[PDB]
């Protein structure tokens, strides 16, 4: 929504945002890395993504990711391949059902947030 | 003013924030705990402060705090005097001129936040 305007606001958000990250992790047994990839996919409806652009959009460093990319593809949340461009490039494909499997579980997540926001103060 | 509604806003916010969090803890060589303590001081303008209070009002872990304190305390932002078992009853005195020092460091940190909101997309 809006940009944080100062010091007081910077702490409120961090404090708040963290409460939400923990609830989720706990409530769903998922890391924010995992949460981030999924959430990225969902908003960027594509059948093919490059980890090179998901990493940078998100703002991480390869390692933090991959693991999260291991557990996810292998949980069947998307298909992961690594062919051609220097053994480097890893491409994640996402078909209609994986794409619903995701869209579904994040719907679970949106429910909670709304709820928690009823008692998670300023 | 502005709770986050979904998984997207949450990611957009967490990302954007974390960016301020490190931009700041880098140009001021300060930690977020240290940031926290000072912003708090500045928000609840009191002559003396009890750690336990501050320790909660924030949301962190004692160890995290103290550390930030002995530095700020040492750096002169406030003063710390311990008193019964010399245990968890550490007081923190903040005289008028530390209230201007803090007041001016935060004052600067605000300038930055305003600027960085022009180089960062939420």
Curated annotation (Swiss-Prot), chains A, B:
Changing residue 7 to A: Reduced binding to the spa promoter. Fails to repress spa and aur expression. Its main location: cytoplasm. Keywords: Activator, Cytoplasm, DNA-binding, Metal-binding, Repressor, Transcription, Transcription regulation, Virulence. Changing residue 82 to A: Unable to bind to the spa promoter. Fails to repress spa and aur expression. Belongs to the SarA family. Global regulator with both positive and negative effects that controls the expression of several virulence factors and the biofilm formation process in a cell density-dependent manner. Required for transcription of primary transcripts RNAII and RNAIII generated by agr (virulence accessory gene regulator) locus. Negatively regulates the expression of spa (protein A) and aur (metalloprotease aureolysin). This is Transcriptional regulator SarA. It comes from Staphylococcus aureus (strain MW2).
């Amino acid at each position: 929504i809006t940009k944080i305007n100062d010091c007081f606001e910077l702490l409120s958000m961090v404090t708040y945002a963290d409460k939400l990250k923990s609830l989720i992790k706990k409530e769903f047994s998922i890391s924010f890395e995992e949460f981030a990839v999924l959430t990225y996919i969902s908003e960027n409806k594509e059948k093919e993504y490059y980890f090179k652009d998901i990493i940078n959009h998100l703002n991480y460093k390869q390692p933090q990711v991959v693991k999260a990319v291991k557990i996810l593809s292998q949980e069947d949340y998307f298909d992961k391949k690594r062919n051609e461009h220097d053994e480097r490039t890893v491409l994640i494909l996402v078909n209609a059902q994986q794409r619903k499997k995701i869209e579904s579980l994040l719907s679970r997540v949106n429910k909670r947030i709304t709820e928690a926001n009823n008692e998670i103060e300023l």
